[PDB]
Amino acid sequence: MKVHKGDTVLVISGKDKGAKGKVLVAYPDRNKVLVEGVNRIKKHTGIVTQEAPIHVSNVMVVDSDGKPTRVGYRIDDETGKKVRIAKTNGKDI
Amino acid sequence: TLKVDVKTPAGKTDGSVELPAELFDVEPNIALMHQVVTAQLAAKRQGTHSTKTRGEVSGGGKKPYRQKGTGRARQGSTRAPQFTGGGTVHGPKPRDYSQRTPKKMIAAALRGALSDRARNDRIHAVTELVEGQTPSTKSAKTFLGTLTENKKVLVVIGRTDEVGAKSVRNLPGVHVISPDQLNTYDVLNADDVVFSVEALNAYISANSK
RNA sequence: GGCGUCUGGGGGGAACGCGGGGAAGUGAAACAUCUCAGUACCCGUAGGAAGAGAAAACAAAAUGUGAUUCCGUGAGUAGUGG
RNA sequence: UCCGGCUCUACCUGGCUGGAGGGCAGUGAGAAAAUGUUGUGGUUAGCGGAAAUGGCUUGGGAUGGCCUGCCGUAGACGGUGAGAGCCCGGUACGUGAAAACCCGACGUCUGUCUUGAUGGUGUUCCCGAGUAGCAGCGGGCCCGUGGAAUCUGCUGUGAAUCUGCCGGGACCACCCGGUAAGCCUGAAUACUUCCCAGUGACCGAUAGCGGAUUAGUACCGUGAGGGAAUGGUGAAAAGUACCCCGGGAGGGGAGUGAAAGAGUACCUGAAACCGUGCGCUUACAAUCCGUCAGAGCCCUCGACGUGUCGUGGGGUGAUGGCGUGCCU
Numbered sequence: 001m002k003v004h005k006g007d008t009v010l011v012i013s014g015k016d017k018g019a020k021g022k023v024l025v026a027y028p029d030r031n032k033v034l035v036e037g038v039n040r041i042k043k044h045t046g047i048v049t050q051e052a053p054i055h056v057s058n059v060m061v062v063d064s065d066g067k068p069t070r071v072g073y074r075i076d077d078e079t080g081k082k083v084r085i086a087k088t089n090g091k092d093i
Numbered sequence: 094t095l096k097v098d099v100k101t102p103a104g105k106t107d108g109s110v111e112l113p114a115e116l117f118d119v120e121p122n123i124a125l126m127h128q129v130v131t132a133q134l135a136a137k138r139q140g141t142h143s144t145k146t147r148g149e150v151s152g153g154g155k156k157p158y159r160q161k162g163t164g165r166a167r168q169g170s171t172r173a174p175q176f177t178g179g180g181t182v183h184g185p186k187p188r189d190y191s192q193r194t195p196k197k198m199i200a201a202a203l204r205g206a207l208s209d210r211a212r213n214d215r216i217h218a219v220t221e222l223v224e225g226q227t228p229s230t231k232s233a234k235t236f237l238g239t240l241t242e243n244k245k246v247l248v249v250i251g252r253t254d255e256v257g258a259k260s261v262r263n264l265p266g267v268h269v270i271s272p273d274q275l276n277t278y279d280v281l282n283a284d285d286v287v288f289s290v291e292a293l294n295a296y297i298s299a300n301s302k
Numbered sequence: 303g304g305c306g307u308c309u310g311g312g313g314g315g316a317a318c319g320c321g322g323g324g325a326a327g328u329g330a331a332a333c334a335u336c337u338c339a340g341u342a343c344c345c346g347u348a349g350g351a352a353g354a355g356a357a358a359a360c361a362a363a364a365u366g367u368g369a370u371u372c373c374g375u376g377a378g379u380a381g382u383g384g
Numbered sequence: 385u386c387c388g389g390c391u392c393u394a395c396c397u398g399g400c401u402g403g404a405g406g407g408c409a410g411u412g413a414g415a416a417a418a419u420g421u422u423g424u425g426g427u428u429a430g431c432g433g434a435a436a437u438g439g440c441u442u443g444g445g446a447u448g449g450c451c452u453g454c455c456g457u458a459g460a461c462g463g464u465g466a467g468a469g470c471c472c473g474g475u476a477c478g479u480g481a482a483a484a485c486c487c488g489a490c491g492u493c494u495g496u497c498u499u500g501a502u503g504g505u506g507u508u509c510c511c512g513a514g515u516a517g518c519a520g521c522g523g524g525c526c527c528g529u530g531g532a533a534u535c536u537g538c539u540g541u542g543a544a545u546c547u548g549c550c551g552g553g554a555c556c557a558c559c560c561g562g563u564a565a566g567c568c569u570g571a572a573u574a575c576u577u578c579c580c581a582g583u584g585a586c587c588g589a590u591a592g593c594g595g596a597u598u599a600g601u602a603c604c605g606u607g608a609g610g611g612a613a614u615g616g617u618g619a620a621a622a623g624u625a626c627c628c629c630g631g632g633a634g635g636g637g638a639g640u641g642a643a644a645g646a647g648u649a650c651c652u653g654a655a656a657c658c659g660u661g662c663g664c665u666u667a668c669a670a671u672c673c674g675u676c677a678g679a680g681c682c683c684u685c686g687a688c689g690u691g692u693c694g695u696g697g698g699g700u701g702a703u704g705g706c707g708u709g710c711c712u
Contacts, residue, residue, distance in 0.1 A: 002472085007611085012437045012471065012504080014445065014619095031472075041513045042640060044625035052620060057464045057472040060437060070471085077431085082431085134585090142586035151594045152610075177590045178612095185586070230456045259457045263469090263476085 001028055001056050002071045002084070010068045011038050020062065031056045055078040063088055094118070095211055099218045099290055102236050110218050112211060112291055121205035129202035132192040133278045144184030147172055153179075157225050169295045199277070206280040215285045217241065218293055222257030223251065233260035238269065239258055240287060247283035249275065257289070272296045 002008060008022045021035035032053035039052045044065060045084040060068035061084075086093045094114055099107040112118075147153075153172030162169045171178045200272060211218055217240050223232040237246060245266045250257045252271050261267045270279050271291040288296075 010437065013447090015465090017445090018437075039620080040619080041622045043622060044639075047625060047639080052622075053470085055464050055622090060471075062437095070435095073432070137585095139584055140586090141584050144587090144591095145593085155610075178594080228457045230458090234456090256457090259476085263456050263459060265459055 001026055001033070003033060003056055003059060003061055008062055009033070009035060010062045011035070011054070012055065012060050012068065013058045014035075014039065015060075015084065026056075027053065035057060035059065061086070061093060063093060064091055065089070069093075082088055095214075095216075097218045097288075099220060100240065101220050102148045102223060102232065104239070107220055107290075109288065110288075112216070113297065114285070116204055116297065116300055117200070117208050117211040117216070119204045119208045122201065125198060126202045126205055126281065129194060129199055130278045131280065132194045133276060135190040135192055138183075138190050139192060140188045142185035143187055144181040146184065147174060147180030150178075150180045152202065184254075202277040203275060206277050207275075207286075210280060210286050215241075215243075216288065217285065218288045218290055220290050222248070222254070222289075223260045225256050228259035230257055230260055230263050234264055237238075237261070237264070237287070239272055241285040243284035245283050246287055247279060248287045248289075249296075250289040251292050251295065254289060254292075257292045273299065 002061050003023060003026060003067050005023055005026050010020050011017055016038040018036055021038050023033050023035050025034040027033065030053065033056055034051055034053055037051070039054045040049050041052045044047050051082065056085050062068050063086050067088050068088040071093065072087050073082055075081070084093050085091070095112045095117055097112060101107050106110060142187075150172045153170040155170075157168050157171055158165075168176075170176075170256045174180055174182045219236070219240070222236065223229050240246075243266075245268070248257070248261050248267055248269050249264075249272055252270065258269050261269060268279060268283060270276075272289075272295045275296065
């Protein structure tokens with residue numbers, strides 16, 4: 001999805017826009033991800049409160065220096081691998 | 094006899110192109126141009142609309158029930174037009190909308206549109222859209238802005254001018270046509286016409302010969 | 303004719319091809335010649351296409367064209383028809 | 385070209401047959417089956433791919449409005465909480481095949497000509513047989529038997545080999561054209577069960593395929609066969625925890641939601657049809673049920689006082705006049 005489980009992202013749209021979080025579950029089928037502390041709902045169980053899936057277009061992968069970016073791919077010609085890079089700085093993400 | 098001075102992307106005038114009177118000074122004919130563009134749009138439209146008549150719907154090959162004794166209206170099939178799910182009486186069918194407009198009418202309409210464009214000096218001539226060998230939409234946009242401030246423009250360049258065609262391709266109001274494919278609809282739809290020098294010369298040579 | 307041994311066939315498929323058999327409602331304001339129509343349907347067969355194809359040909363005195371096939375004209379013409 | 389072996393036998397002469405160069409062709413109609421190398425040649429999976437977390441404001445949410453920039457060989461099209469080139473999938477543009485298959489190319493391979501080629505002179509033989517022609521009965525040609533040529537089926541009869549035969553719309557003569565009774569032949573042409581990529585002044589759930597939902601299903605018929613109906617909560621289920629009435633169903637509070645006039649009987653919610661509340665009217669009355677006058681009661685808009693008129697408006701209407709539904 002260009003975003004992975006364990007990646008930390010910044011929400012760029014919605015009610016919780018501007019809040020940082022950590023992706024815990026991603027759904028390649030639905031283009032939706034689950035992030036820490038965003039899109040929390042109030043389900044009746046007491047009334048529990050937990051996150052709800054948010055579309056992947058609403059999040060941006062944050063950089064090492066805390067700057068959201070679009071992610072790009074560079075190919076490691078030594079071993080044939082293909083790793084993600086950030087387009088704001090070019091550093092490995 | 095109208096004069097058009099050639100402009101270069103560097104911003105300096107190069108020379109001049111002499112527009113013949115019989116090609117750029119004819120009196121526009123509104124009715125003729127209207128007929129020509131209507132025929133053009135009719136030729137563009139594809140008639141891919143069809144409906145199943147009473148004979149092409151599935152089933153309905155038997156007379157339903159007793160004509161008499163029932164006390165109901167007499168029916169010959171369950172696919173009759175009045176029946177729900179029945180056939181269509183006079184529905185759309187595939188057809189061709191192209192019209193056989195004479196050559197002289199089309200040529201006269203194109204000449205009239207071009208002469209109307211030239212009368213208000215909306216005709217511009219350039220050597221090249223951008224510096225060659227590499228498309229550059231920014232340079233082309235800047236040059237077109239210098240040439241005119243209108244919304245819709247028409248760029249007429251040769252089929253070998255790949256760099257210019259690719260450069261002016263993405264602009265929202267720019268339409269690219271070939272010199273031998275000029276038509277009334279494209280000329281009239283555009284506020285300004287930008288002619289390549291080789292394209293303009295080719296058009297004049299092809300027509301006035 | 304029997305025995306043994308090898309190689310083939312058998313059936314399915316929407317349309318298109320070729321060769322055969324082949325209606326009636328209909329129109330003619332009736333109807334039988336005629337039309338509908340060699341249509342509908344049936345039979346035997348293929349191929350990726352099939353069929354035709356190399357003059358025992360047209361033509362009309364032109365010191366003329368030059369296998370077949372397909373498209374446009376010729377032309378709804380010459381004609382044919384209770 | 386050279387060499388060799390044969391034309392009963394050996395010797396001098398002309399013709400057959402093999403072996404070496406040299407060509408010439410090829411999976412082709414012109415014979416056939418194979419086997420290798422090579423082509424960023426193709427097809428059968430993919431990858432990369434520019435530029436905004438921009439400011440103010442409305443909003444549940446910006447993808448709305450105003451104002452700033454940026455990319456553009458990329459402003460095609462979709463998605464994302466409302467109209468997004470700069471959020472995502474992507475697009476322009478470049479890239480990619482281990483293996484299989486398909487196209488070519490060069491080869492092994494195969495045949496084939498070389499025992500051959502040229503232009504001259506006067507005579508005998510051959511040039512596709514139950515075939516052509518004719519006769520009878522038919523078919524099809526513009527031609528329906530007609531003066532009916534060409535082509536063709538069945539039955540009889542049945543020739544010639546080049547001064548021969550056939551055709552030139554009955555037929556005869558002359559000229560002209562051609563050479564039947566043997567066989568193969570690519571391209572131009574027709575089509576789409578199926579796969580791929582798109583398009584639409586085509587439909588949008590009584591439409592469009594019969595079939596957007598269990599669809600040739602349910603169901604009907606012994607059978608061939610006939611053959612339906614049913615789409616939309618919300619951005620996300622956050623699908624109403626808990627309390628109360630009730631056996632439940634259902635509902636009232638409480639919550640979630642921007643909205644429950646979105647509660648899984650769910651977008652919008654018309655008409656027919658059925659209720660509830662209020663105002664007027666109706667039990668001495670012969671009513672195509674309306675229309676024209678019209679008392680009374682109720683409501684409402686102005687002015688002046690305390691209710692009374694007015695270039696007023698509405699609802700219901702006692703009562704009088706008139707009045708024989710629509711369509712074919």
